[PDB]
Amino acid sequence: HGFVDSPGARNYFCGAVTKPDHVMNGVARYPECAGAFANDFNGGYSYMSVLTHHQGRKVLGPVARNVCGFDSETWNGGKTPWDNAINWPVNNINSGTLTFSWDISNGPHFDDTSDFRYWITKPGFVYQVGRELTWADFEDQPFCDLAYNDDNPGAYPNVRADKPNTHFHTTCTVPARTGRHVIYAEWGREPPTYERFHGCIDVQIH
Ligand SMILES: [Cu+2]
């Protein structure tokens, strides 16, 4: 159970940081989360639970009707808060080497993590409020596809478990891009669960 907190995913900003009730009370760090929680108030508190039990975009192909939530089981295979196309907060980043960090404090699965995978929107991508993502918006293959076996931490330098702070830190190379983009991210586990967690990261590349 967890989510990407650097660069912060939609369910970081609206979930881990800004809670539904914060928005209501007008005391939110991110008032723009109003739009994520407008039609699903209490689902906002399950930001760590955007999960499936299959091997994700790479293996099933572009099958899920909703990109960011990947038709999560927690929403009965329908839309999550983070599939909404609203005025999301954005991460300003550069192309090249970047750490993608998962906060797994809510449900660490160090021992049977299998993979981390990231896809990015195609160069021709135009972000627009109210227009929800399609798989056609993203490259077909992940730009970053990291195996892991906690038995042999040595063999995976691009994956770094931090057990005390219950984080995974992963290293990717974000490809040449500029402007507003989305990175779609997956954290997957081995059998027996095959559980997988899904996130979108809003980015402004330089
Ligand atoms: Cu979990």
From TrEMBL:
Task: Provide the GO MF annotations for this entry.
Answer: cellulose binding; hydrolase activity, acting on glycosyl bonds
Q: Name one GO biological process term.
A: carbohydrate metabolic process
Originating gene: 10B
The protein's name in its UniProt record:
Chitin binding protein, putative, cbp33/10B
User: Which residues of the whole protein does the chain here span?
Assistant: 25 to 229 of 337
Keyword Metal-binding on entry: no
Keywords recorded for this protein, A-Z: Glycosidase, Hydrolase, Signal
Q: Does the keyword Phosphoprotein apply?
A: no
Which species is listed as the source? Cellvibrio japonicus (strain Ueda107)
TM region(s), chain numbering: none
